[PDB]
Design brief:
The structure is a homotetramer of 127-residue chains. With 127 residues, chain A is mainly β. Chain A has one domain: Transthyretin/hydroxyisourate hydrolase domain (Immunoglobulin-like, Sandwich). Helix content of chain A is 5%, strand content 46%. The first copy, chain A, contains 1 helix and 9 strands. In chain A, the strands form 2 sheets. In chain A, strands 1, 2, 5, 8 and 9 form a 5-stranded mixed sheet that branches. In chain A, strands 4-3-6-7 form a 4-stranded antiparallel sheet. The longest helix of chain A is centred in the middle third of the chain and has 6 residues. The interface between B and C is medium-sized, with 22 and 21 residues. Strand 7 of chain A pairs antiparallel with strand 7 of chain D. Chains A, B, C, D: Keywords: Amyloid, Amyloidosis, Cytoplasm, Disease variant, Gamma-carboxyglutamic acid, Glycoprotein, Hormone, Neuropathy, Phosphoprotein, Secreted, Signal, Sulfation, Thyroid hormone, Transport. Chains A, B, C, D: Belongs to the transthyretin family. Chains A, B, C, D: Thyroid hormone-binding protein. Probably transports thyroxine from the bloodstream to the brain.
Chain lengths: 127, 127, 127, 127
């Protein structure tokens, strides 16, 4: 599908939710990293959540090879805008990708000033 | 052993945390019922959490027999008393207790106005 | 839209997820109740989760009046099929509806043998 | 007061629960780092949880100065050792500690192979 970047099949979607207001968390920054050979974190994709609190088309399946990826969520800047003070600096989700072939990754995240949970729903797409 | 009622070997404790403030949820009313033989819920025990967000002494080893129980946590009153309007009326935890001998049950509850999780920790008595 | 039942605008959707396998919880029973005048629970809508773990079209906006609704999730039968033993009998979500006009209700639920969280994302639909 | 290192007034405790078995997660390795002045993570403290799923004595009041800290919890090794293959490599909790005087921090973590939540409980010292 899309070359280099884009979403050739949409292999990764990040969905953020606000548990204090019961609404989707809009305009949250999401930075995604891939571990490099030197073993440090190399910038991979990034964006802000839409009106539905989702972020997709961060990457493409040709570009999304097996490796170790890190999803960072600027949760702190998010609360600061609502006048609340958070405890965390941000949230990270570190996972190895496509241990045995690609599939979709939906990284979910539920946020509160002092807590956040994160879940992954890995699904084998079809036609 | 502790007769009548009380907290014999502490077979049942409830613990509530506030995810918005990062503290124990205090003064949360908790009502516990046991499933009667006529499929109705009979009031079993009740209480309010301490400064620590804990509640022990709801029942006793002798009294805590096999059955189906429901811990109802009054999360609404709690949030309302803070100036927030939660989504849920309350949070229930229904389970079969002691089907294979007396166990000790720690019902943990983490609260957000629009979301809540409950985890159960079951342990074997030893002294 | 649809008369009586159906989904005139799709005011309530239940989404269930499996946190042990990282997959949507398929074929889970969901029974929804409305408190009646006598104050007991009157059967309102029901169904089983689709392949995506979602359930919608349970009700219609003309039928979904303000009231107290209860979403019961047969989580126990769900684990029993996977060979695991759960702690809970089921999960309930009790909430008052449309305090000030309708909007969509997505009741979410994340399940584990011994824990489950539930969140509501209430959104004002548009055109 | 407790010099060198230890657990002065217990300014930092980590607690891990297993959502699959309903017990405390035991033998979970935990590494704690402090953000160095050169933006790097310096190893601050480390440990493994007890039968109770707890870890105290990681640091001390004197040593636990203002700064940015990251509690890394090795959730992978834990699940792998059970015959499961988790989704995350580990779980991190990054936060600014003691920006307004010494507080006591209870980092709580609830684990599922495909999901995890972390709640923070901050309290004021009193004796």
């Amino acid at each position: 599908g899309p070359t280099g970047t884009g979403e050739s099949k949409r292999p990764l979607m990040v969905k953020v939710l606000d548990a204090v207001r019961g609404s989707p968390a809009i305009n949250v920054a999401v930075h995604v990293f891939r571990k490099a050979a030197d073993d440090t974190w190399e910038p991979f994709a990034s964006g802000k959540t839409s009106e539905s609190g989702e972020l997709h088309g961060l990457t493409t399946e040709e570009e999304f090879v097996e490796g170790i990826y890190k999803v960072e969520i600027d949760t702190k800047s998010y609360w600061k805008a609502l006048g609340i003070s958070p405890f965390h600096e941000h949230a990270e989700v570190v996972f190895t990708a496509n241990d045995s072939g690609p599939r979709r990754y939906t990284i979910a995240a539920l946020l509160s000033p002092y807590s956040y949970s994160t879940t992954a729903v890995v699904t084998n797409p079809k036609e």
